[PDB]
Amino acid sequence: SSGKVIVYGGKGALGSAILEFFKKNGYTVLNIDLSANDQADSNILVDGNKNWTEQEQSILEQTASSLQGSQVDGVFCVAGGWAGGSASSKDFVKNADLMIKQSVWSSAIAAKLATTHLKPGGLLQLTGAAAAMGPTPSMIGYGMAKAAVHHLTSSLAAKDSGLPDNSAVLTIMPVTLDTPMNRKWMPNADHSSWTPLSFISEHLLKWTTETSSRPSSGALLKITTENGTSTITPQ
Amino acid sequence: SSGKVIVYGGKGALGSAILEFFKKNGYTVLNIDLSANDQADSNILVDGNKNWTEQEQSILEQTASSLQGSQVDGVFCVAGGWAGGSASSKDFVKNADLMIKQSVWSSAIAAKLATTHLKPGGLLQLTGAAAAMGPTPSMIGYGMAKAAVHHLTSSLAAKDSGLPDNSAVLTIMPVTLDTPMNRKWMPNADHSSWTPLSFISEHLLKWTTETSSRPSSGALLKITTENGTSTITPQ
Numbered sequence: 001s002s003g004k005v006i007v008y009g010g011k012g013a014l015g016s017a018i019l020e021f022f023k024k025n026g027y028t029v030l031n032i033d034l035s036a037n038d039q040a041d042s043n044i045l046v047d048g049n050k051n052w053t054e055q056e057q058s059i060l061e062q063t064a065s066s067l068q069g070s071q072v073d074g075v076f077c078v079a080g081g082w083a084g085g086s087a088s089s090k091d092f093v094k095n096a097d098l099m100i101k102q103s104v105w106s107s108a109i110a111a112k113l114a115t116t117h118l119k120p121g122g123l124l125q126l127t128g129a130a131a132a133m134g135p136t137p138s139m140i141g142y143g144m145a146k147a148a149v150h151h152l153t154s155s156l157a158a159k160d161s162g163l164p165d166n167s168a169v170l171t172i173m174p175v176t177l178d179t180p181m182n183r184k185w186m187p188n189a190d191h192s193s194w195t196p197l198s199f200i201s202e203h204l205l206k207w208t209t210e211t212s213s214r215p216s217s218g219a220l221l222k223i224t225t226e227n228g229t230s231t232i233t234p235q
Numbered sequence: 236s237s238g239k240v241i242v243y244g245g246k247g248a249l250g251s252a253i254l255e256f257f258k259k260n261g262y263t264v265l266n267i268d269l270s271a272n273d274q275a276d277s278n279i280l281v282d283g284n285k286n287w288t289e290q291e292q293s294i295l296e297q298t299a300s301s302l303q304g305s306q307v308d309g310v311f312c313v314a315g316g317w318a319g320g321s322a323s324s325k326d327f328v329k330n331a332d333l334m335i336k337q338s339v340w341s342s343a344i345a346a347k348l349a350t351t352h353l354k355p356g357g358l359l360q361l362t363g364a365a366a367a368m369g370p371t372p373s374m375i376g377y378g379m380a381k382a383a384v385h386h387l388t389s390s391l392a393a394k395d396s397g398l399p400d401n402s403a404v405l406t407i408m409p410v411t412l413d414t415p416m417n418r419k420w421m422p423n424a425d426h427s428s429w430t431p432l433s434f435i436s437e438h439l440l441k442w443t444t445e446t447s448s449r450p451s452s453g454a455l456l457k458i459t460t461e462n463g464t465s466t467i468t469p470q
Contacts, residue, residue, distance in 0.1 A: 056328040087350045088397030096343055097287040100335060104379065108331055115322045135389040135453075137396040144339065144383040144390075151382030154370040155322075161372035162323030218370075 002026030004072045005208070006063070006117075008110045009079030010037045013179040014197055018076055021201035030066060032059060033079070042066045052101075056109050063113060071119040074208045077110035078127050079103075084139035096141030103127075103145040107152055111169075115162040122167050123208050126153055130173040130222050133235060150220055157218025168217035170207065172200065173235070175224050195225045203232070237261030239307045240443070241298070241352075243345045244314030245272040248414040249432055253311055256436035265301055267294060268314065277301040283336070291344050298348060306354040309443045312345035313362050314338075319374035331376030338362075338380040342387055346404075350397040357402045358443050361388055365408040365457050368470060385455055392453025403452040405442065407435065408470075410459050430460045438467070 010031030083095035129146035136143030245266030266275035318330035364381035371378030
């Protein structure tokens with residue numbers, strides 16, 4: 001009863017952590033992903049075989065059916081994976097396509113959901129990429145896709161973008177997150193530079209409940225950890 | 236027989252002007268577009284209903300059959316149209332989809348054509364968007380797509396991107412071009428602030444034949460005209 005929030009990508013490591021955290025803190029949580037999270041109060045099913053507009057329609061219809069006359073306090077989008085390759089790579093385009101579908105499609109639909117269901121003064125959070133702040137010749141598609149998300153962020157923060165009054169959009173860019181996969185493939189790394197998922201969940205709850213604790217709307221927030229201490233620096 | 240160049244978007248106002256100017260200067264020109272330009276030496280037709288990878292394979296195979304192991308002196312991409320809308324617009328996603336396909340898909344395939352056929356020291360030219368240098372709340376999809384093209388430019392210019400040795404990539408951003416459509420919809424505008432298509436065609440030929448006349452590789456070139464004089468300003 002503390003409120004409602006949408007987690008787009010609730011099946012992932014960070015997404016599941018965020019969903020669990022808000023639930024523990026009294027919020028009703030709606031998950032939007034390729035499969036259901038049996039811990040969520042509501043599950044919106046995404047069909048990966050459908051195109052962009054088909055996905056938008058289905059996700060919007062399902063979310064509206066679930067919310068009825070309620071609005072949400074926040075929409076958190078953390079969906080998407082990775083695929084690299086330079087222009088000379090055999091799969092340069094193939095992977096570029098996958099990256100648009102994974103980062104751009106989701107971010108845009110999350111934004112559409114916010115213009116429709118986010119309460120005035122609410123929070124929309126998107127996921128960018130620290131690497132996209134500069135050239136990315138070894139992973140051009142990923143770079144392009146994320147740069148589009150960064151631009152989307154700037155357009156949404158601007159006047160008459162469609163977001164509700166007094167709301168804010170924040171885009172996170174963590175350098176290294178502590179996940180099961182990172183522990184497996186880099187088993188001997190120094191975790192003193194790894195950002196705990198709880199650092200993110202905690203900040204999302206803070207920004208959701210206290211508007212005065214928020215960085216400027218449209219901020220691209222680079223998150224780093226050194227000597228066990230995490231820091232958020234607007235770029 | 237001055238050489239060979241590829242014009243992706245040869246049916247457009249600017250694309251046709253470029254094609255005509257290079258043909259007039261002794262070049263063999265290959266056109267890539269939705270329909271054929273009867274003045275081109277070769278025509279590569281694209282099916283807009285095919286997906287990104289299908290389009291890539293189709294364009295690459297047709298171009299290779301037309302070149303037969305030969306290289307090109309330049310690849311010029313000016314394809315793409317426009318669709319607007321803020322995030323609250325009914326067609327926000329629909330148009331974002333159209334804009335990614337029109338600007339991003341084409342720019343990436345043009346880049347692929349360059350890694351495969353552009354001569355060392357050759358030129359790859361892409362088309363960005365001056366408006367995308369800042370927030371675009373009234374045309375979010377267009378802004379996202381063009382921002383991706385701007386980032387793609389920075390990645391391609393970097394070492395090991397896949398482009399040939401000593402080649403350069405330049406991306407143009409004209410504020411206003413003198414086209415038939417602009418003359419029709421803005422009939423009483425002052426043309427002293429309109430950039431003549433010839434200005435662009437002339438610079439492409441110069442940059443193609445004289446490497447020392449080129450701005451830095453990776454440059455985003457804003458083009459403005461005032462009192463009849465045109466100026467190129469790197470961002």
